[PDB]
Design a protein around this nucleic acid. Structure first.
Ligand SMILES: [Mg+2]
Ligand SMILES: [Mg+2]
Ligand SMILES: [Mg+2]
Ligand SMILES: [Mg+2]
Ligand SMILES: [Mg+2]
Ligand SMILES: [Mg+2]
Ligand SMILES: [Mg+2]
Ligand SMILES: [Mg+2]
Ligand SMILES: [Mg+2]
Ligand SMILES: [Mg+2]
Ligand SMILES: [Mg+2]
Ligand SMILES: [Mg+2]
Ligand SMILES: [Mg+2]
Ligand SMILES: [Mg+2]
Ligand SMILES: [Mg+2]
Ligand SMILES: [Mg+2]
Ligand SMILES: [Mg+2]
Ligand SMILES: [Mg+2]
Ligand SMILES: [Mg+2]
Ligand SMILES: [Mg+2]
Ligand SMILES: [Mg+2]
Ligand SMILES: [Mg+2]
Ligand SMILES: [Mg+2]
Ligand SMILES: [Mg+2]
Ligand SMILES: [Mg+2]
Lengths: 156, 93, 226
RNA sequence: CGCGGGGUGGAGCAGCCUGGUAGCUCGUCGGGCUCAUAACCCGAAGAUCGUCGGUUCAAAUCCGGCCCCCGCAACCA
RNA sequence: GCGGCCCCCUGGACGAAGACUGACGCUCAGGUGCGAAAGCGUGGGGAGCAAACAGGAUUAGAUACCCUGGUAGUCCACGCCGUAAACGAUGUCGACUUGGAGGUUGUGCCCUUGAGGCGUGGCUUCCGGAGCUAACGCGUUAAGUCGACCGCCUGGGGAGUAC
RNA sequence: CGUAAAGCGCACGCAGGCGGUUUGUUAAGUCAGAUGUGAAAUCCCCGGGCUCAACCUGGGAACUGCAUCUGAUACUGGCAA
């Protein structure tokens, strides 16, 4: 039931005494489409080993997100290192409008309707980290009412 | 019965002396070939080298459970070890 | 069972390290200072100690596996003997970084230990030029010292009880990563952020550790006997 | 040869559709548990997904054949 | 930037206790002032040192490094110049936020038992937590959390050059 | 805006910007309401007519503005203590 997407594969180098040693990295995101999404990195000599290592890492290191009918509770901003991410809820039928790295994470998490924008560096690794961080730092009416010591309608 | 930890702790400080250099009577808890564990009433039982228990004839004159006079050198050597130097206590003698 | 403030003061629980080496997090549990020594507050210790015993009692009543951890030369023998008195598991020598997060590797080492001991005991062979046999026995001895306390653990433990949280910070970090609750005796110089159930007290005195360990083993057996 | 469907640790079932992760039940050996057996617990063992291939960075899944299985098929004095 | 000792004139900073004024404050475009060294002008002074310069060497060459000399200059008085990697490469002012080891300079208390112990102000060096940072690192003297005002940036070269 | 471009060499200071706390008053900023105006077309909403659409067209909303009047006194400003 978990849904997984490969976001980016990259070839790196080590420059050993004899010359360059080439290895590959993967970036993957897995999710249940119902509020749980994790990302794994994954690094290996060959592309299949890399994508496999990444998926296994992504299945764990998965977090839960307080979704709202496939949409965000409220506008959130997420920044990891040099990437700043802004995501705000939209009406049903708008679609998922976002950059490629954010597109995958929001699709896999189950956000059907979102308006998103990425400021700063769009490096895929940091964009994914920043959007996941933003989604986790998003609270819901029940948890905010519990935190504030009131009821939901009293908060509305 | 709220016997205060404050009351109880003042009593304990009156019993034992915590100054560096005081000779404290300590119990031999264990005798190894090289170290003897001596309790005193501080943060930790002190491992005193057996060399200090050897007389001029090389014999260990102590059995487990004896009270031994040990000179309190330091309660805390940064590692929670209470440094007990009985060899320095023989100066008083 | 139940321990008394009088007994803990006698055991020397109230002592802490020098003031300079303290961790400012510990400040709530510090009664004060005397002779440049921190004095832990036993009014904070007793309810926290009893409150931790309750949860250990609960885990033991659910057939929970308890891992006793302490590798200080002071507490190495006490933790092994105390853990064995209640049919539980222990680590009394250097904690292998990754015992819990890399359990898949430790399990293979357990398989090697079991197979190796079978040969030297069940296989009884030793008819291996008497030099390869002897060196093979050394390997058996090495693994036995390392993994004796968990050789039959089978899976991940349900809770860790650790002496000297600062000294054994690595084990606490693995548990937090894996969600395993940690009960820890936390001295004034230690960090209590990673500990789910903090028991503030001296952790270097054999008398104090024996006090803690005797009570814990007693509570575990009561929870199992139920 | 007709059409359809199925084959997955020794047995019984998920997994297949969307390509990346082999799970649930019984059985078997051992241990804890029990006075003991038995039941029960901890482990452990056991399929390469009928096979042949094709695709694809990568297949139990996607493609084809063969092999069977199950079901149907209008025609016996 | 300031380094022998002494005198005269003079500026600021800090502490203790108390009294007084009663928002009198912060920042600051333009403006004004100060501003290492080199340099310039007038007039002195000139021991040492030393651009330029002379000579000897080294070198394939040596308009250099090295050696022997040596003028301006370095010094004084009075003007000018107004620039430095003028750097903590970190504008000024205020508030808030865990700790440790020190240096220096005040002051209060306790047994000063003997240079001790315990507080409390100023300035300062190192280490380090949360946090921040692209990373290095910064970390109560912030590059943390904020507020007021000001200066400056907009790819590299052309060029801090032309007019 | 430490090292990537970017903190004046430093200071004093006029114009300017900003202003601890309390009370009263004022009502300038601010806020609320009302009134006048903000041409029609255009853009937007609901409709109507060309066989449909482009196009045309009815009503509305809007025109984020300005001015006047009437109220509010938290904040900011003025005045007084
Ligand atoms: Mg960019
Ligand atoms: Mg100026
Ligand atoms: Mg000069
Ligand atoms: Mg001159
Ligand atoms: Mg002259
Ligand atoms: Mg010369
Ligand atoms: Mg300049
Ligand atoms: Mg300078
Ligand atoms: Mg500098
Ligand atoms: Mg500069
Ligand atoms: Mg530092
Ligand atoms: Mg110029
Ligand atoms: Mg120039
Ligand atoms: Mg540079
Ligand atoms: Mg720069
Ligand atoms: Mg400056
Ligand atoms: Mg100024
Ligand atoms: Mg004011
Ligand atoms: Mg004003
Ligand atoms: Mg008005
Ligand atoms: Mg109009
Ligand atoms: Mg029509
Ligand atoms: Mg119209
Ligand atoms: Mg007013
Ligand atoms: Mg007013």
């Amino acid at each position: 039931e978990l849904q997984e997407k490969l976001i980016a594969v990259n070839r790196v180098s080590k420059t050993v005494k004899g010359g360059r040693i080439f290895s590959f990295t993967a970036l993957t995101v897995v999710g249940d489409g119902n509020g749980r999404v994790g990302f794994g990195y994954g690094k290996a000599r060959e592309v299949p080993a890399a994508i496999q290592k990444a998926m296994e890492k992504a299945r764990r290191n998965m977090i839960n997100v307080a979704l709202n009918n496939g949409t965000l509770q409220h506008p959130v901003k997420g920044v990891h290192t040099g990437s700043r991410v802004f995501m705000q809820p939209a009406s049903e039928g708008t679609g998922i409008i976002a950059g490629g790295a954010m597109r995958a994470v929001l699709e896999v998490a189950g956000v059907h309707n979102v308006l998103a924008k990425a400021y700063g560096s769009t490096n895929p690794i940091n964009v994914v980290r920043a959007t996941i961080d933003g989604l986790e730092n998003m609270n819901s009416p029940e948890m905010v009412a519990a935190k504030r010591g009131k009821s939901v309608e009293e908060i509305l | 019965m709220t016997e205060s930890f404050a009351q109880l702790f003042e009593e304990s400080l009156k019993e034992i002396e915590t100054r560096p250099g005081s000779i404290v009577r300590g119990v031999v808890v264990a005798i190894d070939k090289d170290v003897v564990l001596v309790d005193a009433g501080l943060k930790s039982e002190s491992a005193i080298p057996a060399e200090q228990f050897k007389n001029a004839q090389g014999e260990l004159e102590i059995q487990v459970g004896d009270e031994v006079d040990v000179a309190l050198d330091a309660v805390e050597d940064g590692f929670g070890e209470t440094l007990l130097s009985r060899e320095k206590a023989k100066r008083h003698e | 069972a139940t321990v008394s403030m009088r007994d803990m003061l006698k055991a020397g629980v109230h002592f802490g390290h020098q003031t300079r080496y303290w961790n400012p997090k510990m400040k709530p549990f510090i009664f004060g200072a005397r002779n440049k020594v921190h004095i832990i507050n036993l009014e904070k210790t007793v309810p926290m100690f009893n409150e931790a015993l309750a949860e250990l009692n609960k885990i033991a009543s659910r057939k929970g596996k308890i891992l006793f951890v302490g590798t200080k030369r002071a507490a190495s023998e006490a933790v092994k003997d105390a853990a064995l008195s209640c049919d539980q598991f222990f680590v009394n020598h250097r904690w292998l970084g990754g015992m819990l997060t890399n359990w898949k590797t430790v399990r293979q080492s357990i398989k090697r230990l079991k197979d190796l001991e079978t040969q030297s005991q069940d296989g009884t062979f030793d008819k291996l030029t008497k030099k390869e046999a002897l060196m093979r026995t050394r390997e058996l001895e090495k693994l036995e010292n390392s993994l004796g306390g968990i050789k039959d653990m089978g899976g991940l433990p349900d809770a860790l009880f650790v002496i000297d949280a600062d000294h054994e910070h690595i084990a606490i970090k693995e548990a937090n990563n894996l969600g395993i609750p940690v009960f820890a005796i936390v001295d004034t110089n230690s960090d209590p952020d990673g500990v789910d159930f903090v028991i503030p007290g001296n952790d270097d005195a054999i008398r104090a550790v024996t006090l803690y360990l005797g009570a814990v083993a007693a509570t575990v057996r009561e929870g199992r006997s139920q």
